[PDB]
């Protein structure tokens, strides 16, 4: 159904079943599918396409030429009624693409809130994206990719399917990411390599000097110890008992699959 | 002319002379030129632009924001009535671009069948593309480029004008291709380099173990012999007399211009 | 106001206050804001978006899916009425983006004349672009970037905010530019490096053999002398007294901030 308070540009095409929230705004030449759900105060500038089984939050801003809920580029996919969930307060820039999941992958492509998806940024089937993230121009995510909170991805950067990107992480741009990227680190180059701890961000974010240091130590333990993960894991765990920020490493390790970057 | 069985969204703009096949489908806000020819069962999702002297097959699927038959970015080009031919069963993704040829280059940009042109993939004036190919996200082809059957091109990969890309070849992605790429090989890096034989594909494709080996030998002959091409050519030719898959090398060599990758 | 001689496609949406020049051409499904000013003989193919406080010259050609005057991706920006000025005779290709400036940056994004902005090329808030330039496919400019006359930028090339790009310069493509790029040079690679003097262009442009040589010497002085800039500056200045083409180095140095490439 559609809100009396909602604005629908005469030129737009809303399909029957499409549910549109109050005070939302649908600009010219947009197309909204019958299974779409657009939250309050959300805006579709114009020439936007929203289809599939898509759920979109409130106060989102979506620019022209974006294509959301679209069918994916998987060859196995065949019209199965997969989904897309998008949080609130996102800013989705021109030409951005967000594809519906695969039953195989789990049928769901998810995007959190308060994120910034720059131009031509691409989100593949079955990804998962947190909050307060930033994906720069042309950044491209492969299928099954997971990006965590506060993560920032350099433009023209490619993330390889199944990879995980830690919270507070910083990815160069003009980079290629093939293994998992642990929290708080900065990565770089074609085949990213760790450059250390994203201090600046931790700073800007409110982290204590102690955590920031605790964090720094963990990194060392990891990349500098010369020990194998299997040997450090515990060391970190311990540390996490005093410094909570560290537990992040742990949880992450528990998800890592492509192993980490080096 | 237009098929009574063909669907034309009221919002679309079909120009007089535009010939549209049976059961084709033209979505909202599309524009089809007067010299366009769209085959049976072909679909234009919406917000699509087809112009120029363009011939499009059947059962093709073309997504929003694609621009086909468009005029090219050559500075010498001046409105000459050049062409574009597209086969059948292709899947042309959002924001893809396919430009009309140059009289100089030969006036024709051609695309085969059953290909997969991912997002923002770009096909320049005068290219030639086979069948069952895949061009990934942001892949960009320069003018006069030739891509052969079963070829696969990594996303964010650039191919340099006049280059040739062998059948069954695999190109990395985040790569730059400046010389010709012989059949069955895998290439990689900014200034691609051979990595060997795309075994996996040959496997998946039905190639015999013998051909696959014959192929493997030819590669060696090429890159490992330490002989100059002029010296190996014959060796290969011979081999091709027993293993037909090999003749591919030959034909290729007969087209190579930028010389090969190393 | 709008010219009786101007063509406005019924489907387009021109806002009240939008001033459109004589003999201009506004294609289907375009949107022109109330503060837009489009010069004589300028063309908007279709599905184009022009908004903000934008001033556009004459005889410009703008292709579908371009987005001009759009609001920028700066997080500090908040709806301040910043501007965009575009010269004449430009050719702005599909999916190009040109964003409005920031009050902070100076509130103005400017583009000269006779330039060629290829597909998906991106111009950030507060940039400055000269004349007769070329930005290739996917080329992306960061904020506060300055590109000078005759400059040419390789596709898939990224320029870092605050950088300056000399006149007659040539940038590789699949490159990353982080420091200023002096006039007449060729740059390349991920983290561009000087390759020498763009002789070919100087040739094609009409430069004398003497200037071309004078130029060549200056380069040497710079990169080969092994002296520090502070020590060469004067040497060059002097030289500029006889060879005017050289003064370019000087002026440039006077703007350089990120220092130069090496």
Short description:
The structure is a homotrimer of 262-residue chains. Chain A is α/β, with parallel strands linked by helices and 262 residues long.
Features:
homotrimer; 262 residues; alpha/beta; UDP N-Acetylglucosamine Acyltransferase, domain 1; Udp N-acetylglucosamine O-acyltransferase, Domain 2; 2 domains; eleven-stranded mixed beta sheet; eight-stranded parallel beta sheet; 28 strands; acyltransferase; transferase; trimeric; UDP N-acetylglucosamine O-acyltransferase
Question: How many angstroms separate the termini of chain A?
Answer: 52 Å
CATH hierarchy class name of the largest domain in chain A? Mainly Beta
Largest interface comes to: A-B, 20 and 23 residues
Radius of gyration of chain A: 20 Å
Q: What is the correct CATH architecture of the largest domain in chain A?
A: 3 Solenoid
Describe this structure in words.
Chains A, B, C: Pathway: Glycolipid biosynthesis; lipid IV(A) biosynthesis; lipid IV(A) from (3R)-3-hydroxytetradecanoyl-[acyl-carrier-protein] and UDP-N-acetyl-alpha-D-glucosamine: step 1/6. Chains A, B, C: Involved in the biosynthesis of lipid A, a phosphorylated glycolipid that anchors the lipopolysaccharide to the outer membrane of the cell. Chains A, B, C: This is Acyl-[acyl-carrier-protein]--UDP-N-acetylglucosamine O-acyltransferase. Chains A, B, C: InterPro entries: Acetyltransf_C, Acetyltransf_C_sf, Hexapep, Hexapep_transf_CS, Lipid_A_LpxA, Trimer_LpxA-like_sf. Chains A, B, C: It catalyses: a (3R)-hydroxyacyl-[ACP] + UDP-N-acetyl-alpha-D-glucosamine = a UDP-3-O-[(3R)-3-hydroxyacyl]-N-acetyl-alpha-D-glucosamine + holo-[ACP]. Three copies of one chain form a homotrimer. By secondary structure, chain A is an alpha/beta fold. Chain A has two domains: 1-196, 3 Solenoid (UDP N-Acetylglucosamine Acyltransferase, domain 1), CATH 2.160.10.10; 197-262, Udp N-acetylglucosamine O-acyltransferase, Domain 2 (Up-down Bundle), CATH 1.20.1180. In chain A, 16% of the residues lie in helices and 27% in strands. Chain A has helices spanning 199-205, 209-224, 229-239, 247-253; strands at 7-8, 13-14, 19-20, 25-26, 31-32, 37-38, 43-44, 49-50, 53-56, 61-62, 67-70, 83-86, 91-92, 97-99, 108-111, 116-117, 122-123, 128-129, 134-135, 140-141, 146-147, 152-153, 158-159, 164-165, 170-171, 176-177, 185-188, 193-197. The first copy, chain A, has an eleven-stranded mixed beta sheet with strand order 1-4-7-10-13-16-19-22-25-27-28. An eight-stranded parallel beta sheet of chain A has the order 3-6-9-12-15-18-21-24, with no helix packed on it. In chain A, strands 2-5-8-11-14-17 form a six-stranded parallel beta sheet, with no helix packed on it. In chain A, a hairpin with a 4-residue loop joins strand 27 and strand 28 (193-197). The longest helix of chain A is centred in the last third of the chain and has 16 residues, at 209-224. Chain A is elongated and about 65 Å long. The A-B interface holds A 13, 29, 31, 47, 49, 65, 67, 70, 73, 75, 95, 97, 120, 122, 138, 140, 156, 158, 176, 190 and B 11, 28-29, 46-47, 63-65, 93-95, 116, 118-120, 137-138, 155-156, 173-174, 189-190.
């Amino acid at each position: 159904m559609i809100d009396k308070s909602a604005f629908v540009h005469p030129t737009a095409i809303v399909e029957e079943g499409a549910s549109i929230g109050a005070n939302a705004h649908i600009g010219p030449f947009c197309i909204v599918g019958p299974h779409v759900e657009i939250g309050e105060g959300t805006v579709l500038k114009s020439h936007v396409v929203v289809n599939g089984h898509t759920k979109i939050g409130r106060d989102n801003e979506i620019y022209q030429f974006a294509s959301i809920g679209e069918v994916n580029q998987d060859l196995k996919y065949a019209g199965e009624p997969t989904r897309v969930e998008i949080g609130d307060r996102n800013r989705i820039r021109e030409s951005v693409t967000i594809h519906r999941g695969t039953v195989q992958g789990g049928g769901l492509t998810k995007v959190g809130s308060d994120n910034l998806l720059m131009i031509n940024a691409h989100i593949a089937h079955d990804c998962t994206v947190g909050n307060r993230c930033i994906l720069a121009n042309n950044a491209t995510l492969a299928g099954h990719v997971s990006v965590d909170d506060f993560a920032i991805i350099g433009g023209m950067t490619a993330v390889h399917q199944f990879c995980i990107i830690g919270a507070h992480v910083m990815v160069g741009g003009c980079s290629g990411v093939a293994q998992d990227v642990p929290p708080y680190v900065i990565a770089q180059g074609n085949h990213a390599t760790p450059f250390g701890v994203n201090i600046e961000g931790l700073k800007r974010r409110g982290f204590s000097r102690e955590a920031i240091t605790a964090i720094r130590n963990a990194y060392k333990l990891i990349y500098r110890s010369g020990k194998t993960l299997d040997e450090v894991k515990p060391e970190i765990a311990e540390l996490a008992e005093t410094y909570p920020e560290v537990k992040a490493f742990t949880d992450f390790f528990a998800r890592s699959t492509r192993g980490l970057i080096r």
